[PDB]
């Protein structure tokens, strides 16, 4: 049978032009009183998946174009 996409990951990552994985930041749901504006400003912007994590998860997103 075909490999199944990991649907949780597919809802959270996106493949960039060069084959990096774009992601959002954690700590962006609630408790904004406890985080500084600088933190909040930075967590708002997207990020990339780390090398160590990418090798762990790349096959889970193999089908995604």
């Amino acid at each position: 049978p075909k490999m199944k996409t990991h649907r949780g990951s597919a809802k959270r990552f996106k493949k960039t032009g060069s084959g990096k994985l774009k992601r959002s930041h954690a700590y962006t749901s609630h408790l904004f009183a406890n985080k500084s504006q600088k933190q909040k400003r930075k967590l708002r912007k997207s990020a990339v998946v780390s090398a160590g994590d990418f090798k762990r998860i790349k096959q889970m997103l193999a089908n995604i174009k």
Partner: protein, 49 residues
């Protein structure tokens, strides 16, 4: 699986939605039109053919 450490995908938030009515166009750059003959009526049907 990370042996019970909360997995990376679960630590990060879901983002966005998918549009039902998303349109993807077949893009053609000018360089590809350069391959046709001069005074040609370039159309989708010709490009496809």
């Amino acid at each position: 699986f990370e042996g019970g450490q909360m997995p990376l995908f679960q630590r990060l938030p879901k983002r966005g939605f998918t549009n039902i009515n998303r349109k993807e166009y077949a893009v053609v750059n000018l360089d590809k039109l350069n391959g046709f003959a001069e005074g040609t009526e370039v159309t989708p049907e010709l490009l496809l053919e």
